Structure 1
Amino acid sequence: LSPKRTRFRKQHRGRMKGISYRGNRICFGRYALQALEPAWITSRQIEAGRRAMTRNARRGGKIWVRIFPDKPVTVRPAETRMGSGKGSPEYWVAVVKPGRILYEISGVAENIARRAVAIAASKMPIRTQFIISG
């Protein structure tokens, strides 16, 4: 959602790169949501997907939110554009590159996790798929 302490208030951007070879594996959970598409995912889509698959499981099992934002995005107001004064308490952002696991789920059967992970992939600006723990 949002980090409590910030070492630095405002932080500039950074560009996406190739396939994340570290966060591609499955640590916990049986099923996952691997992203094929490098972009930003705010904490707002993470709340949307989290409510989506928690209320789409709704009887048993547990999900695993992998990513945390850890960088802010400063939106300048409509004040005729010259400075980056204050935009730090505005929306946070997680960098996602291809390969990276976004969500995981366990305790759920086959097609209930297919609709749980697949319906909650519609709350997201980047194309994904669901991955079994091989």
Structure 2
Amino acid sequence: LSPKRTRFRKQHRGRMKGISYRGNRICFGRYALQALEPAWITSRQIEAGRRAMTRNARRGGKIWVRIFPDKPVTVRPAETRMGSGKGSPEYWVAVVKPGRILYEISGVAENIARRAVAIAASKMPIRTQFIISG
């Protein structure tokens, strides 16, 4: 859900620039949930979706949170935006660009995988679709 070591406390923002290579073909699993829309994904989404496909699969097959957040986003109180002292202890975020794999799931029959990864796509802020291990 978060990294153990705080290398640098705060870390300023970045920006998305669409994938062209490292399309993250498939490595584990057999069914992935390929992102299409660049955006951030917090660690709490990740929690949500994971719960979704774990309790939905619920019989077999292994989940794979293919990406780990590793960058902090800060938030400031309501004090007229003076100096950004402390907000990194707030949520973490994984920058996810297009063409990227978010989950992977094996050991599950076809359509059960479709319901797991479809629901999981409902819990998550960007339009995805599920891919088979070609």
- Give the 4+ runs in structure 1 shifted more than 6 A: none
Deviation at residue 78 of structure 1 after TM alignment: 1.2
Unaligned runs of 5+ in 2: none
Deviation at residue 8 of structure 1 after TM alignment: 0.3
Deviation at residue 69 of structure 1 after TM alignment: 0.7
Deviation at residue 14 of structure 1 after TM alignment: 0.3
CA distance in 1, matches of 2:22, 2:42: 21
Q: Which moved more, 1:24-33 or 1:14-23?
A: 14-23
Answer yes or no: is the 8 Å Cα contact 1:20–1:97 preserved in 2. no
Cα 1:23–1:89 change in 2 (3 A) is farther
Unaligned runs of 5+ in 1: none
CA distance in 2, matches of 1:12, 1:23: 26
Deviations 1:71-123 (A, max 9, x none): 10010111222110100100000000000000000000011000000111111
CA distance in 2, matches of 1:12, 1:56: 37
> Match for residue 57 of structure 2?
57
CA distance in 1, matches of 2:93, 2:20: 17
> Match for residue 76 of structure 1?
76
Answer yes or no: is the 8 Å Cα contact 1:32–1:102 preserved in 2. yes
CA distance in 2, matches of 1:89, 1:17: 27
Deviations 1:25-54 (A, max 9, x none): 100000000000000000000000000000
Provide the aligned C-alpha RMSD in A. Answer: 0.9
> TM-score scaled to structure 1, two decimals?
0.97
> TM-score scaled to structure 2, two decimals?
0.97
CA distance in 1, matches of 2:55, 2:96: 24
CA distance in 2, matches of 1:33, 1:20: 18
CA distance in 2, matches of 1:131, 1:38: 18
CA distance in 2, matches of 1:20, 1:104: 21
Deviation at residue 129 of structure 1 after TM alignment: 0.1
> Match for residue 117 of structure 1?
117
CA distance in 2, matches of 1:74, 1:20: 29
Cα 1:84–1:121 change in 2 (3 A) is same
